[PDB]
Amino acid sequence: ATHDIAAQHLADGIAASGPAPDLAAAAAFLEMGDRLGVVAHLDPDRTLETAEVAAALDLPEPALVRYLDAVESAGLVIREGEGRYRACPDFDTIRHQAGYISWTMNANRPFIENARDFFTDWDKAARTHVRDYREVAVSSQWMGSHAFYPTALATIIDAAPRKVVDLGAGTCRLLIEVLGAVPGSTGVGLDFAADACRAAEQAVAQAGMTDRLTVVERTIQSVATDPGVLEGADVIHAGFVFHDMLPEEEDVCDQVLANCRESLAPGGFLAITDAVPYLRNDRERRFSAAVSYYHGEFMRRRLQSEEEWVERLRGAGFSDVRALTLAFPTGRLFLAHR
Amino acid sequence: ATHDIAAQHLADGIAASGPAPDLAAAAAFLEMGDRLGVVAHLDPDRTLETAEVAAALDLPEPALVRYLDAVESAGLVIREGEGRYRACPDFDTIRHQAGYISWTMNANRPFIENARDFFTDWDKAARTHVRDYREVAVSSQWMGSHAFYPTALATIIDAAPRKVVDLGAGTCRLLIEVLGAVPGSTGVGLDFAADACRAAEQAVAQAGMTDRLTVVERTIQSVATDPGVLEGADVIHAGFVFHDMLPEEEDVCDQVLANCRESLAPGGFLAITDAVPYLRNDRERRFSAAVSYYHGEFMRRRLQSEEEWVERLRGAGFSDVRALTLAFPTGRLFLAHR
Numbered sequence: 217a218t219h220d221i222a223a224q225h226l227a228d229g230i231a232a233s234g235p236a237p238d239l240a241a242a243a244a245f246l247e248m249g250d251r252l253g254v255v256a257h258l259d260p261d262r263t264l265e266t267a268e269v270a271a272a273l274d275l276p277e278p279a280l281v282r283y284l285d286a287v288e289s290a291g292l293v294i295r296e297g298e299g300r301y302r303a304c305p306d307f308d309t310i311r312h313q314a315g316y317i318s319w320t321m322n323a324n325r326p327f328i329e330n331a332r333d334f335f336t337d338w339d340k341a342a343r344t345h346v347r348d349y350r351e352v353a354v355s356s357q358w359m360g361s362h363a364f365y366p367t368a369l370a371t372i373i374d375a376a377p378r379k380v381v382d383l384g385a386g387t388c389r390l391l392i393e394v395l396g397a398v399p400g401s402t403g404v405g406l407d408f409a410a411d412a413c414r415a416a417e418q419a420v421a422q423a424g425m426t427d428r429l430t431v432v433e434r435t436i437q438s439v440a441t442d443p444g445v446l447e448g449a450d451v452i453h454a455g456f457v458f459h460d461m462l463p464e465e466e467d468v469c470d471q472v473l474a475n476c477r478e479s480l481a482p483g484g485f486l487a488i489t490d491a492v493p494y495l496r497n498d499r500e501r502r503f504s505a506a507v508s509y510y511h512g513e514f515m516r517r518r519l520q521s522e523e524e525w526v527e528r529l530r531g532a533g534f535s536d537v538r539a540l541t542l543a544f545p546t547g548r549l550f551l552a553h554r
Numbered sequence: 555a556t557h558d559i560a561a562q563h564l565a566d567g568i569a570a571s572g573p574a575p576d577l578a579a580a581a582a583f584l585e586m587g588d589r590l591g592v593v594a595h596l597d598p599d600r601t602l603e604t605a606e607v608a609a610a611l612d613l614p615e616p617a618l619v620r621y622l623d624a625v626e627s628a629g630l631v632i633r634e635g636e637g638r639y640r641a642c643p644d645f646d647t648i649r650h651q652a653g654y655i656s657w658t659m660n661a662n663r664p665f666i667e668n669a670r671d672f673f674t675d676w677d678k679a680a681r682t683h684v685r686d687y688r689e690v691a692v693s694s695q696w697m698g699s700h701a702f703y704p705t706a707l708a709t710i711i712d713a714a715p716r717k718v719v720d721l722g723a724g725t726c727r728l729l730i731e732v733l734g735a736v737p738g739s740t741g742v743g744l745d746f747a748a749d750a751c752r753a754a755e756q757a758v759a760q761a762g763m764t765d766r767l768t769v770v771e772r773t774i775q776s777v778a779t780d781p782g783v784l785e786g787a788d789v790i791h792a793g794f795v796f797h798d799m800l801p802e803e804e805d806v807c808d809q810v811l812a813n814c815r816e817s818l819a820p821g822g823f824l825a826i827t828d829a830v831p832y833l834r835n836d837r838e839r840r841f842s843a844a845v846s847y848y849h850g851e852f853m854r855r856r857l858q859s860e861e862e863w864v865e866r867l868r869g870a871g872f873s874d875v876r877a878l879t880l881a882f883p884t885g886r887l888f889l890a891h892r
């Protein structure tokens with residue numbers, strides 16, 4: 217008998233768990249590896265040399281090997297001879313899916329663990345339980361690799377601009393790839409962070425485009441008063457940067473949008489990626505609500521609907537505004553034409 | 555044009571993300587809610603009354619309502635009139651799947667965030683970065699609801715015992731349900747924790763079985779020298795308790811297993827659930843490796859293969875040992891007959 221009862225429970229249990237064990241394990245292995253610096257050396261097209269990577273990362277090589285042997289058992293890498301490991305063929309998709317888990321469970325963990333304090337004294341909780349910006353940045357890039365970054369890339373590229381401006385450039389990755397794909401164009405990577413700009417500047421020298429790529433280390437709010445760098449841009453790009461100005465700096469935000477419209481060359485457009493609040497459709501609703509609740513309740517940053525965004529961009533002077541659904545749940549791309 | 559490029563990127567992005575956004579959001583909402591005490595009041599068959607639950611949980615009712623309105627938007631609960639919410643029909647499956655994410659990303663977070671310290675000075679890291687046992691316990695119960703708990707329940711029930719002994723009872727939930735399903739039987743819930751035993755004892759009075767259910771507050775290692783409580787048991791149950799004795803207390807472990815064999819009534823068996831290390835098959839391997847790496851590398855607790863378990867149980871005197879694959883990846887149920 218016992219063989220048969222355990223047989224149905226096994227089948228029923230397999231169905232109930234579904235893909236969650238796999239994703240749970242992938243997310244933990246990949247966050248742990250990324251914190252160690254290992255994940256950046258894993259790629260499906262080349263091998264990681266443990267002897268060299270352990271020295272680059274200042275890890276004891278036996279400890280690094282035990283880690284890679286665990287993720288090899290997990291099936292996320294392939295051992296290609298002693299001391300060499302290569303990521304599994306679909307590694308980048310697995311890493312992308314882990315970005316969602318890392319964002320809600322790791323980047324936003326202070327909100328998960330301390331919700332009571334936020335409900336009691338939001339001001340004290342907001343400056344006591346703060347997010348790790350490196351985890352926010354990495355999980356966002358993982359989520360963006362397949363869910364919003366390619367749409368922006370292909371859109372800017374297709375317009376074939378000659379002057380691109382990226383508000384909140386950070387890594388400057390978007391600029392390097394639009395310059396390397398459209399000939400003769402130039403780019404400007406505005407970003408306030410010192411940390412994001414030294415690492416960006418050297419990668420500008422890496423590609424060898426320092427003549428075409430300016431990096432100014434100012435805030436995006438500085439555009440409201442000093443919109444000089446924008447002059448003549450064919451595409452101005454803004455990825456998930458505007459909602460941090462709302463609702464506290466709405467006037468500055470509306471001024472930056474109006475300066476953006478004024479400063480575009482004819483036929484140019486402003487391409488904004490951002491998150492709309494609490495969608496209802498079955499695909500997007502669950503992650504939408506997580507993005508919306510984290511922002512509304514814990515960060516008190518205003519997410520705007522498509523209607524609000526369209527009205528705000530048309531009040532900034534833009535003739536026509538197109539909204540494009542992104543694969544990233546609750547993410548929208550707004551193309552605001554001059 | 556831009557409509558069409560964004561159309562393929564959307565479809566491609568939807569495929570790449572798959573179920574990860576949904577699970578990411580579900581896990582964060584449900585861990586946050588469980589930490590608040592809310593999740594225990596959510597059930598698909600009855601409503602949560604915000605006015606009363608906010609008082610029971612000592613939360614400001616407006617804050618609780620904003621939380622439930624977010625998870626309602628997420629689709630995890632249904633508003634059934636003002637102030638009343640009911641969990642979505644498949645809530646228990648979603649909660650089960652979130653148990654895997656909560657276990658690897660939350661319960662085991664000290665290992666994710668501090669792997670460098672463990673690689674450098676394991677002894678210092680092991681007592682510096684310790685897991686939250688409440689999160690370990692809750693995520694384990696969520697994982698077990700559909701992946702290993704029903705198999706043990708149905709197995710013990712089907713044997714129709716008259717004396718059941720649960721090593722590491724903790725919640726005493728397993729005992730209450732085997733006593734409530736087989737008539738005239740008695741149970742013993744051995745567990746070292748004071749915290750786990752006061753809450754268990756009152757629930758014994760809740761069901762009204764305090765005459766049939768003994769609760770002794772001893773360690774399972776105390777069975778190696780004092781196996782008195784086991785005498786005459788038809789089923790002895792041990793859920794994920796033995797690997798914490800290995801490899802440091804192997805002699806005590808082998809003594810408990812031998813005392814278990816000796817103490818069984820004729821036809822009785824010892825039912826052990828535990829985790830085998832690093833499986834290779836495609837379904838189990840990824841989560842297997844996570845369970846195995848957390849235990850081997852960070853907790854230094856020995857997981858045994860089916861072969862090692864069979865040999866150890868036969869060395870303890872058991873005539874025949876059956877191994878049963880559980881839905882819980884890398885989980886196995888061993889039935890060791892007298």
Ligand SMILES: CC(C)CC(=O)C(=O)O
Pocket residue numbers: 352356456491507
């Ligand atoms: C929604 C993410 C893409 C980034 C973000 O806005 C945040 O984490 O605050």
Ligand SMILES: CC(C)CC(=O)C(=O)O
Pocket residue numbers: 690694794829845
């Ligand atoms: C494998 C889990 C079921 C429990 C466990 O063994 C642990 O978290 O240490």
Ligand SMILES: [Cl-]
Pocket residue numbers: none
């Ligand atoms: Cl004009």
Ligand SMILES: [Cl-]
Pocket residue numbers: none
């Ligand atoms: Cl005998």
Ligand SMILES: [Mg+2]
Pocket residue numbers: 225226228229700701702703704705881
């Ligand atoms: Mg089952």
Ligand SMILES: [Mg+2]
Pocket residue numbers: 226227228230231
């Ligand atoms: Mg099945």
Ligand SMILES: [Mg+2]
Pocket residue numbers: 229230231233234235
């Ligand atoms: Mg499954």
Ligand SMILES: [Mg+2]
Pocket residue numbers: 278279280281282283673851
């Ligand atoms: Mg290691």
Ligand SMILES: [Mg+2]
Pocket residue numbers: 499500501502503504545575576579
């Ligand atoms: Mg979703």
Ligand SMILES: [Mg+2]
Pocket residue numbers: 362363364365366367543563564566567
């Ligand atoms: Mg895409």
Ligand SMILES: [Mg+2]
Pocket residue numbers: 564565566568569
């Ligand atoms: Mg598709």
Ligand SMILES: [Mg+2]
Pocket residue numbers: 567568569571572573
């Ligand atoms: Mg999808």
Ligand SMILES: [Mg+2]
Pocket residue numbers: 335513616617618619620621
């Ligand atoms: Mg709230």
Ligand SMILES: [Mg+2]
Pocket residue numbers: 237238241837838839840841842883
């Ligand atoms: Mg698995």
Ligand SMILES: [Zn+2]
Pocket residue numbers: 456459460511517
């Ligand atoms: Zn944000």
Ligand SMILES: [Zn+2]
Pocket residue numbers: 794797798849855
């Ligand atoms: Zn364990």
